[PDB]
Amino acid sequence: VQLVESGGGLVQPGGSLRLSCAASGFTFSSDGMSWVRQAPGKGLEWVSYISSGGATTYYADSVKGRFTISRDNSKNTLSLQMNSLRGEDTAVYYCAKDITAPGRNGLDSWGQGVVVTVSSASTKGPSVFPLAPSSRSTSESTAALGCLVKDYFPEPVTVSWNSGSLTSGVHTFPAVLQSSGLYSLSSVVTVPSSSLGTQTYVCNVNHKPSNTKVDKR
Amino acid sequence: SVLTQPPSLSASPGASARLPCTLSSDLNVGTKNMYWYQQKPGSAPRLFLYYYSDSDKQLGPGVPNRVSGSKETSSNTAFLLISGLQPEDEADYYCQVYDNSARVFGGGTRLTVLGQPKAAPSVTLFPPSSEELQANKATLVCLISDFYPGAVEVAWKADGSAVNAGVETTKPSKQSNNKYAASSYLSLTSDQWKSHKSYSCQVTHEGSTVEKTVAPA
């Protein structure tokens, strides 16, 4: 059984995408089908169902009126029309067999999914702010300082410290994607407290997609 | 209509794991078909178990006979049973039913097959920077590192009351020493920040909670 989705990508809020899924390895026209979505780092939620012959369609409340599910049983394709897209809709979209047998149902087979990203930005440089030591945090000599890298798009950003001279104790975290469509990210360093009066800390933020660099003291 | 799953479970290879799913009171576990999907990291879900009763059940394609299910009508709970745990069983597991043609998923349970020493999270909370505040903005940053299993849940408090909006949390990411890291952001206005005496980040790791606190003064 193969289910191969296509037609995702980036769209601005209030726009439209059309997803497609081509099926093989089973008699497609005999089976019901569903779409299921998974927002980044969250769980599964069902989107829509269409029956083997197209007569019956169902929609989740968060999607009803905006999306349309479709089938072409001659071509063995499943389709999802997505209108009036908003930030909630950013997710991976899976196509699945949603079967009727005697006494059971079930999502028996799943495609590998297509990414749908809804961002109102297209290219945004970050705002970099200091994360100042702010407390002894004693641990004999250890202090944590950082840089917050706020509201940038798209990925990626890289971060250095003191132009690549400071590498031990550097922890640059994976980015979060917020409901606004923008990424934020943090990098911290563990440093001797004794050195905070002698040593300058500079984080080197590179955002190649927007042709921006920042050195934040 | 809600399906309640624990956030995470861990067990050693060769042991048995018992994954619960509690159905809200509008549903009767006795007469519901139960579907369990396995999601390994980076992969689409997969049908893992269909369970209705000990006489009506079916394993997913490829799923070994180490797997089974059960139901307890008194607590309205269904169970997924995996014995002789192998490292290959480490995944996220979702229960699902059909409810008047709506497809309802539980929230997922992350099952870790222990292959390395446990470690409690190291948690640092940073307040908004003075530069950001002076731009009428206030991002709190909670950084969580060096933990195993790679499963944590993050809540926020303002003056001792739960925070209900403005939170975004990354999924855990494997770091260089094979432990896990995650981050959480609380996005406020400056005037919001100044309205409370304290904010707190609460990090839960396998049922134990650590709380760090910062004050706007």
From B100, B50, B98, B45, select the one nearest B71 (Cα to Cα): B50
Mutation for testing the A interface, residue in B141, B146, B147, B214 having most A CBs under 10 Å: B141
Distance (Å, rounded) from C-alpha A101 to C-alpha A215? 62
Residues A100 and A52 in one domain: yes
Domain end (from A90, A118, A146) = A118
> Which residues partner with B213 through β-bridges?
B200
A72, A89, A118 - which closes a domain: A118
A11/A15 Cα distance (integer angstroms)? 6
Distances in Å between the alpha carbon of A192 and those of A26, A75, A160, B146?
64, 66, 18, 20
- Helix/strand/coil for B15: coil
CATH code assigned at A142: 2.60.40.10
Pairing of strands B199-205, A17-24: unpaired
B-chain residues within 8 Å CB-CB of A188? Answer: 124, 143
| Residues A65 and A9 occupy one common structural domain | yes
Q: Are residues A9 and A95 located together in one domain of the fold? A: yes
- Residue A178's closest chain B neighbor by CA? B168
Residues on chain A touching B123 (C-beta within 8 angstroms)? none
**Residues of B contacting chain A (CB within 8 angstroms):** 33, 35, 37, 43-47, 50, 52, 56, 58, 60, 94, 96, 98, 101-108, 124, 126-127, 129, 131-132, 139, 141, 143, 145, 168-171, 173, 175, 181-183, 185, 187
CB-based contact A147:A128 (threshold 8 Å): yes
CB neighbourhood size of A16 (10 A): 12
For residue B63, give both structure tokens: 């799923």
CA angle B81, B104, A114 (to 5 degrees): 95
Please tell me the distance in Å from B108's CA to the nearest CA on chain A.
6
Q: Do A186 and B141 touch (CB under 8 A)?
A: yes
CA distance B207 to B9: 10
Other C-beta atoms closer than 10 Å to the C-beta of B43 total 13
**B131 → chain A, closest CA residue:** A129
Q: How far is it, in rounded angstroms, from Cα B96 to Cα A106?
A: 9
Spatial distance between the Cα atoms of A98 and A104, rounded to a whole number of angstroms: 10
| One domain for residues A55 and A113 | yes
Whole-number Å distance between alpha carbons of A94 and B47: 13
A178 vs B33, B168, B175: nearest CB: B168
DSSP letters of chain A?
-EEEEE--EEE-TT--EEEEEEEESS-GGGS-EEEEEE-TTS--EEEEEE-TTSS-EEE-TTTTTTEEEEEETTTTEEEEEE-S--GGG-EEEEEEE---BTTB-----B---EEEEE-S-SSB--EEEEE---S---TTTEEEEEEEEEEEBSS--EEEEGGGT--TTEEEPPPEE-TTS-EEEEEEEEEEGGGGGT----EEEEEGGGTEEEEE-
Nearest-Cα residue of chain A relative to residue B107: A43
Say which residues have a Cβ less than 8 Å from residue A75's Cβ, sequence separation at least 6.
none
Q: In order of start, what are the domains of chain B with their CATH numbers?
A: 3-113 (2.60.40.10), 122-214 (2.60.40.10)
Q: Which residues pair with residue A213 across a beta bridge?
A: A206
DSSP, collapsed to helix, strand or coil, labels residue B188 as strand
Residues from chain A contacting residue B108 (CB–CB below 8 Å) = 43-44
Answer yes or no: do A12 and A114 share one domain.
yes
How would you classify the pairing of strands A91-97 and B161-162?
A: unpaired
* Tally of structural domains, chain A: 2
Nearest chain A alpha carbon to B180? A173
Q: Give chain B's end-to-end CA distance (angstroms, integer).
A: 44
Q: Are residues A113 and A132 in the same domain?
A: no
Closest CA to A199 of A157, A126, A141: A141
Residue from B43, B50, B129, B173 whose CB has the most chain A CBs within 10 Å, to mutate? B129
Question: Closest by alpha carbon to B97, among B26, B46, B5, B34?
Answer: B34
Q: Which two tokens stand for residue A152?
A: 């940038």
Q: Judge: A104–B52 Cβ closer than 8 Å, yes or no.
A: yes
Assess whether A17 and A95 both reside in one domain: yes
Question: Same domain, yes or no, for A176 and A114?
Answer: no
Which residues, 6+ apart, have CB-to-CB distance to B182 below 8 Å? Answer: A173, B144, B145, B147, B152, B154, B169, B170, B171, B172, B173
Say if CB A16 and CB A85 are below 8 A apart. yes
B131 three-class SS: helix
CB contact under 8 A, A174 and B45: no
The Cα of A113 is separated from the nearest Cα of chain B by a number of Å equal to 7
Q: Is there a contact between B179 and B119 (Cβ–Cβ < 8 Å)? A: yes
User: Looking at residue B215, what DSSP letter applies?
Assistant: -
CB A149 within 8 A of CB A184: yes
Residues A7 and A52 in one domain: yes
Interface contact B101-A58, CB threshold 8 A: yes
- Residue B123 · residue B181 · CB < 8 Å: no
The parent domain of residue A208 ranges over 127-216
Q: How was this structure determined?
A: X-ray
> In chain B, helix, strand, coil percent, each to 5?
5, 55, 40
Cα separation of B181 and B150, whole Å?
8
Mark whether A44 and A105 lie in a shared domain: yes
Q: HEC states along A21-52?
A: EEEECCCHHHCCEEEEEECCCCCCEEEEEECC
- H helices of chain B, in order, are 130-134, 190-193
Q: Which of A81, A97, A118 is the last residue of a domain?
A: A118
Closest chain B residue to A94, measured at CA: B44
Nearest Cβ partner of A186 from B104, B132, B183?
B183
* Closest chain B residue by Cα to residue A150: B139
Question: Distance (Å) from the C-alpha of residue A48 to the closest C-alpha of chain B?
Answer: 9
8 A C-beta contact, residue A94 and residue A40: no
Resolution of the structure, angstroms:
2.2
Beta-bridged to residue A70, according to DSSP, are A79
Which of A45, A131, A179 has the CB atom closest to B141's CB atom?
A: A131
| Cβ pair B185:A176 closer than 8 A | yes
Distance between CA atoms of B168 and B184, rounded to whole angstroms?
Answer: 6
- CA dist., res. B25 & res. B6, Å (int): 18
- Closest C-alpha among B144, B114, B139, B158 to residue B205: B144
- Please check whether residues A83 and A157 belong to one and the same domain: no
Q: Is A35 in the same domain as A102?
A: yes
Q: Say how far apart CA B36 and CA B93 lie, in whole Å.
A: 7
DSSP code of B130? H
**Contact at CB, B101 and A106, closer than 8 angstroms:** no
Q: Which two tokens stand for residue B125?
A: 């909370």
Closest to B33 in 3D by CA, of B8, B16, B54, B51: B51
The closest alpha carbon to B23, from B73, B86, B87, B61, belongs to B73
